[PDB]
């Protein structure tokens, strides 16, 4: 998994050398930003259910047809909406992992790799997830740098979807 | 590869769970010892050629047969490969140390090393002695408060020693 | 030149992407360490002539044979000793450049690349420069992280020589 | 490539000089403006897809001939390349902004671009419009205090504008 | 562009040789299938306007939210509905190009290359196009092998979208 | 690689023989079944995405444990690999169908797959289920006369079922 | 590269137009002339070495200075390069003939060739004569009805002659 | 072995995709031409010993020395002549194989690969074989497209020899 | 690889010793045997095609089953590989001969060969016969004074024989 | 062109270094052998006419058909025989060049490169030349190491032909 | 590449002629001079580092501006490239000397070098000074009879100086 | 190990061919030079002890520090001086190996590969060894070509050190 630390190590190793002071300062940079990131992770996690429920509702209100169009692909059913909330929670959970390791690595590997293929194959609209993420950004209620951290990763996901 | 943070996240993911507040606090304990962990890594980087060379010098004073004609460290190509291995182990131990996880060291360096030295005829017990001398030198540097605010790093120095020990046991 | 910033950029560009949060974080680590870095740079600079003088003399005392045995390649002569102080001054100036950019880039580029060839061709002993650099570490009188910054780059040069 | 620090160093080295206390002070000032410069770049990265697609949407609405059959942005391969160029310009501008120097932009991206577009038959004046729209969207985001502590970023926003302008001139 | 003939030629050329009997035999396979292909192309072309207009309606009835959800990327406006019909016509025109050359080449080059990027960027749903393509398959009125030819390329497009 | 014709030729060459009139008659009979063999392969190609996607969907509806955190098809990268493996088998099955010989399938695709999956931790019986579902979908497409002259394709549809079965057993 | 079909499609897409009735008619005619076009290409393929060697023989009988010591076709390496070039032109002309379009010949073979021969000191007028001898040999085979249903191939033979002519004009 | 079907399969696999309509058309091509090809293969097979005999005699008539030069590589001896007829029979059998599969594959694989090395090592003149081949072309008495198929592969072999 | 001189140096180095006067005398005798050793290698070089082809001819005359259809040397590709293997063996034998040491033969050619033939289905015993025929043709040439000052080459021709025997034993 | 000297240089250069004692020795070897070589070269050149004529005649006697068979390809006619004598003189002249430079380079370059293609395209038998080369070996009348040099290169040509 | 012998050969071949007895006589003379020629090259090889270093030291003593900051030979990377360039020229000159022909020096070294230096900003006249110093040192070594039979080598030493001049003129 | 003979073999083998005259000629160059090479090797070996001892003393006089200056790396002790005589003996022994195989191979393999790494790590001065090699050159007392052979390899070591 790519983190500021594993990344600094892979670069030093690819050059057969000890870490550089530049790389130590880089890791110090992650240690410094971690307080804000861990606070964002804690907050999103304690509010996970209401964020997820509220995000799914927001997608259902914006894309009425998804809960209407009855087929395997739409949340027109209990299973359909359950998978939707489950997907939404996966996004939230990935966001907290990114915060925890200080990099997009967890989301890149567990969710973004293969995202295009899965959304295409199961006809899932990236726009649905964009709305869920916008909802979380507008709803987590974080402040200061913990909020910046949270939003930076939520925006990263939004960008992977558009 | 994984650092300590990523290891906790991978375990959590496979279980479908958010990290608990306990896990978050344990990672905050790692963040709090970060400056110290950086000092230890900086000590190793800043003294790398001495840790390696002085350790190799002591190994060859204790075991002259390695450098006598026919020995595994005789000829400059072999002497140089031997010093490079000490440096490679030292680099990997320092990576494990900044990662706070032995994964990079076990995976990219130790795995298969025992078999490699046996195939080459390099005496593994001599390599482990070399690695133990580098550990002694590094831990001595690490316990040296000159150049750092005074404090207790016994927990980090113990962890550093564990990485060295993993390497020494792996070569034989 | 490799600095924490250009390395962050070269890395992102190599992947055809925008810098990510991990990278901004690394750059902030550079900015946070920069205060001690610059203090060390200002101090080593104001004391450069004293340090260069003291480092040159520590070398002649330790390898009096240089000031002894003559020819063009020695401390025996005027041009020799002039070139010695000049080289020492180069090491010190590169050290302050590394401090200013936050990485070993300047020293790697302006001094270390081609160093063994030059030392071998002109029969300059790396041990001479190591004595000079140890002297500077022992004489700059910095304290706290400013000292750590200075010494890390001074130790980086000793390692390039050994 | 050079960042603003490296640039002062490279100029100093060629003259064999230590940086002056005055130059060291100008660099301290840039360090002090670092968080703000990082906010600006984060705003660009966080809004990259929007800055690019909304600006392209506006361009094709103002210049429909680009997307009709025979236009330089007709077919998805060409439309894709056009969006890609806009993203490339935005990435390089953002690199110039974090570096506090236009070097990376000028050398890796703008050098020869004008010749490239003329050879392709891509209308450079249209690409400049695309770049001016991305600049407007970006400067507007940079001037928005939502998310940051209120303060003056006029120097940084002006500087960001100069980088987009360098790009808009170079493609024509 | 890749067609059965340029492909036979590229294969012989990559081996620095003249085409051989197997290759001429393959090309005649194309000429033989071509009468059904051109029959399909003449029909889709003479019926283009009814097919395109018919397809657009089918999409608006299946996704009534695009005719209502007003914004830049929807059939909410005259421009959007004209763009929608324009796109559908692109798909029909490409299918006729493929018929004529005996391969997917024209569609791959003019439409499919960069398709994922375009639908993602402008938030266009693959599902919309699939519905239009299904309508065309259901409405062209060709039979026998001419229908097989048309359907084969329309299905190739459906596959590219899912 | 060998199709049905090359297989007969290779056996005849090793015996230094020309094909007999009986063999020529048998190949002529295969030539006669060509349009039908082509229709079956066109049917697979034309419905590849649905055959794979609907079949995976059924599999995950039956074995929900595959996609939950920790399961083999969890995370988009694994789900993507799973879908990909299904299209690979379908692709190879379609190859065997046009070649009229299980050879390419057994060689480039089935041989060793069992071990690969065991090594990976991928449940073989689950893969055999996915293959079995694609088989049902494909054979059902092949037996559908809409779009083809009405006729008997039972021996071809039987042959098609045989290739899929070979795959299902090759994976567990 | 483009065959005659792709070329019409490329002209239509540039105008954003469905094929015209006259375009669809011309394409129907190409198909109808297919077996005949194949007979011409098969004649070249089946007589390639004779077409090349008998033409080179005539070229050297007419221009013995090419093979005199110091001549451009003197030494086997240069004679082999010369024969290779003739076979290369014949190959590409045969490609343009099956394609019904000169794009493959122009782009992969003729482009820059005049400059290459000038740079080598290869006399272009002689290369053109070698090309004209192959065309004569090939057109003559093309007019031979032994082995084909008798009929009119005059447009196809003229088109073949045109491809050889483009090659001969491109070399000097 | 290269045939139109193995070749289409090898290309689709190299590109990780299903067979294209272009490739299905190429195989249609092979099925369409196979009636003439099998007809030629049956007649050449049936007349093999006659064709082989006439061919060897044509070679001895044209190259009188080969039959009167008592050496290993000459039709001079019984072994030499037995091998000559045997070789001619190989070209003829390979020709029928090519007709059978619809490509030059069998002849490329079993006879042309290494052919220059063998003729060079054993001092066999390619001209002898071309003569046997021309005799076969002149003597099979096929007509129509069955004759075109045979002659094409026989000419393919003459070209490999010159 | 090692030649006869390097092998003695290599063994001396492992013992950390200077060559003794007796070893130096042995090497001086080798230098004295040099021209004759060069004549032997030249004879092989000058007759390589005949040694290989005539030997193959004799093997195929006594073992016609190798070349009839189904035989390991049937098809030109397989005959070409069989001739190639004889040449390779002859080539390595001649290198061992010029080097006065069998190391290049053992390392680059014979080690692993027996395995290869077994897996291939190539009859090792026939390969040994082919080698024994080349050895007999080669030794015969080497003992032929035609073209060399008449003298004694018994030691060298006996050594040549040993290299062929090593190859012959290594293929079974 | 490859000679013992250009070869040593090419090697030294390829490794970016000065020739080493081993190559000086190698070059010394060429100087040592050169006296035998130049004597062979002088003698072959002095008797070239005689040798070329007898070689050609030896070929006509052994392959009567070539001086008997109609076709440009045969030394039946004056031109065919003039080409033949010309070719044989090319082999002799290249042999003298090899002797002169002390290596096979001139023959490799001017005659062997492309030999297989020429002999195949123009249907020239490698066997005719082998016979002429054998005649030259038996008729140059050189002795000692000069004969060794000459035969080595003539045998080298024979090997390239078989 | 051509040595002196290959050059006469290439010139004779283009004329279709055998070398004359006079050319043969002239080459025998070159053979006679071989040992002396080999002595010269061996003198250059055995003293290369000193020829190169003492010459650079002399150049920098006369032109201190080259190593001052901002000068073309300032920083170790540039000083190393300057020393490498001097060594490259010394090498190609030595090659010319043993080839007895300047062709190799002209083709692989001096060609386009004047331009290369102009573009870099490297002062051609200084490079020429460096070459002239190396010429001086090598010519002096060449005229030194210690370690060689006493004799006249004037012709060869003059040839050696010519090669150096060719280099000195080619760089500026 | 690289020798004129193994190098010839490598090149032939690198081209899948037998050695040709040029290369035999090259090996003959090594055989002709070998008498002087073995004379030099035999003499340097019989005088090894006094050459080695003399060489060490010569180094101790030129570089007095190493005899005084404390430290393992400096011969300020019995061990340091024993290692010194040991290294010098290695250089002499490698010189005799080169003389025996006719190339720098032994020296390149056993001593020069890794030399820069060792001298830098153990802080050994390349100038100390040059002094010892110069002394051996000035003290072996060989004459003629045997002296030429001996000095060529001793100067090759000197060049490796500078
Ligand atoms: C069982 C497989 C289904 C079935 C099929 C079936 N098909 C045909 C005949 C034809 N099918 C084709 C199709 C192709 N030939 C090709 O060239 C290609 C693409 C390049 C394809 C996909 C064609 C040309 C024919 C002949 C059509 C004509 O009008 O002549 C038959 C008819 C009998 C035959 O054997 O020719 C049949 C039975 N029929 C069923 O009912 C099954 C559901």
SSE succession of chain A: HHHHHHHHH
Small molecules bound in the structure, each named once: phycocyanobilin
Work out the count of structural domains of chain A: 1
Helix content of chain B: over 70%
Radius of gyration of chain B: 18 Å
The arrangement of helices and strands of chain B along the chain is HHHHHHHHH
- CATH level-two architecture of chain B: Orthogonal Bundle
What's the overall geometry of chain B? flat
Count of helical segments of chain A?
9
Instruction: Report the top-level CATH class of chain A.
Output: Mainly Alpha
Give the N-terminus to C-terminus distance of chain B in angstroms. Answer: 24 Å
Q: Beta fraction of the residues of chain A?
A: under 5%
User: Could you name the CATH homologous superfamily of chain B?
Assistant: Phycocyanins
In total, the number of domains of chain B comes to: 1
Organism (chains B, D, F, G, I, K): Gracilaria tenuistipitata var. liui
Protein name (chains B, D, F, G, I, K): C-phycocyanin beta subunit
Pfam families (chains B, D, F, G, I, K): Phycobilisome (PF00502)
Membrane topology (chains B, D, F, G, I, K): Peripheral membrane protein
Keywords:
heterododecamer; A: 162 residues; Globin-like; 0% strand; B: 172 residues; mainly alpha; 9 helices; binds phycocyanobilin; antenna complex (chains B, D, F, G, I, K); photosynthesis (chains B, D, F, G, I, K); C-phycocyanin beta subunit (chains B, D, F, G, I, K); phycobilisome (chains B, D, F, G, I, K); chromophore (chains B, D, F, G, I, K)
Describe this structure in words.
Chains B, D, F, G, I, K: The modification N4-methylasparagine is found at residue 72. Chains B, D, F, G, I, K: (2R,3E)-phycocyanobilin 3 binds at residues 57, 75. Chains B, D, F, G, I, K: (2R,3E)-phycocyanobilin 2 binds at residues 39, 72, 77, 82-88, 149, 151, 153. Chains B, D, F, G, I, K: It is found in: Plastid, Chloroplast thylakoid membrane. Chains B, D, F, G, I, K: Keywords: Antenna complex, Bile pigment, Chloroplast, Chromophore, Electron transport, Membrane, Methylation, Photosynthesis, Phycobilisome, Plastid, Thylakoid, Transport. Chain A is mostly helical and 162 residues long. Chain A has a single domain (1-162), classed as Phycocyanins (Globin-like, Orthogonal Bundle). Chain A has helices spanning 4-14, 21-46, 48-62, 64-68, 78-101, 105-112, 115-121, 126-139, 144-160. In chain A, helix 2 crosses helix 9 (144-160) and helix 5 packs antiparallel against helix 6. The two termini of chain A are 24 Å apart. In chain A, 56% of the residues are buried. With 172 residues, chain B is mainly alpha-helical. Chain B has a single domain, classed as Phycocyanins (Globin-like), CATH 1.10.490.20. Chain B has helices spanning 4-14, 21-32, 34-46, 48-62, 76-99, 103-110, 113-120, 124-142, 154-170. In chain B, helix 8 packs antiparallel against helix 9. Chain B is flat, with a radius of gyration of 18 Å. The J-K interface holds J 1, 3, 5-6, 8-10, 12-13, 16-21, 24, 27-28, 31, 34-35, 38, 41-42, 45, 48, 93, 96-97, 100-102, 105-106, 110 and K 1-3, 5-6, 8-10, 12-13, 16-19, 21, 24, 27-28, 31, 34-35, 38, 41-42, 44-45, 48, 88, 90-92, 94-95, 98-99, 104, 108. The structure holds phycocyanobilin. Phycocyanobilin (CYC) sits between chains F (35-36, 38-40, 42, 142-145, 148-151, 153, 156) and E (33, 144-145, 148).
């Amino acid at each position: 998994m790519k983190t500021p630390i594993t990344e600094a190590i892979a670069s030093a190793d690819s050059q057969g050398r000890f870490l550089s002071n530049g790389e130590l300062q880089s890791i110090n940079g992650r240690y410094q930003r971690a307080t804000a990131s861990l606070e964002a992770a804690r907050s999103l996690t304690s509010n996970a259910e209401r964020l997820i429920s509220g995000a799914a509702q927001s997608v259902y209100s914006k894309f009425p047809y998804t809960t209407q169009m009855q087929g395997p692909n739409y949340a027109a059913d209990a299973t359909g909406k359950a998978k939707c909330a489950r997907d939404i929670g996966y996004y939230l959970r990935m966001v907290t992992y990114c915060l925890v390791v200080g990099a997009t690595g967890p989301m890149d590997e567990y969710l973004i790799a293969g995202l295009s293929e899965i959304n295409r194959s199961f006809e899932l609209s990236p726009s649905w997830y964009i709305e869920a993420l916008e909802y979380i950004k507008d709803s987590h209620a974080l402040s200061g740098q913990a909020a910046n951290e949270a939003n930076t990763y939520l925006d990263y996901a939004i960008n992977a979807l558009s | 590869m994984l650092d300590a943070f990523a290891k906790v996240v991978a375990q959590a993911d496979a279980r479908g769970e958010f990290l608990s507040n306990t896990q978050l606090d344990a990672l905050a304990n790692m963040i709090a010892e970060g400056n110290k962990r950086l000092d230890i890594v900086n000590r190793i980087n800043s003294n790398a050629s001495a840790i390696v060379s002085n350790s190799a010098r002591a190994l060859f004073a204790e075991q002259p047969q390695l450098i006598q004609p026919g020995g595994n460290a005789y000829t400059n190509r072999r002497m140089a490969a031997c010093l490079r291995d000490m440096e490679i182990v030292l680099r990997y131990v320092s990576y494990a140390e900044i990662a706070g996880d032995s994964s990079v060291l076990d995976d990219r360096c130790l795995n298969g090393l025992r078999e490699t030295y046996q195939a080459l005829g390099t005496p593994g017990s001599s390599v482990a002695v070399a690695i133990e001398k580098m550990k002694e030198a590094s831990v001595s540097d690490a316990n040296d408060s000159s150049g750092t605010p005074s404090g207790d790093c016994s927990s980090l120095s113990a962890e550093l020693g564990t990485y060295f020990d993993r390497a020494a046991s792996a070569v034989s």
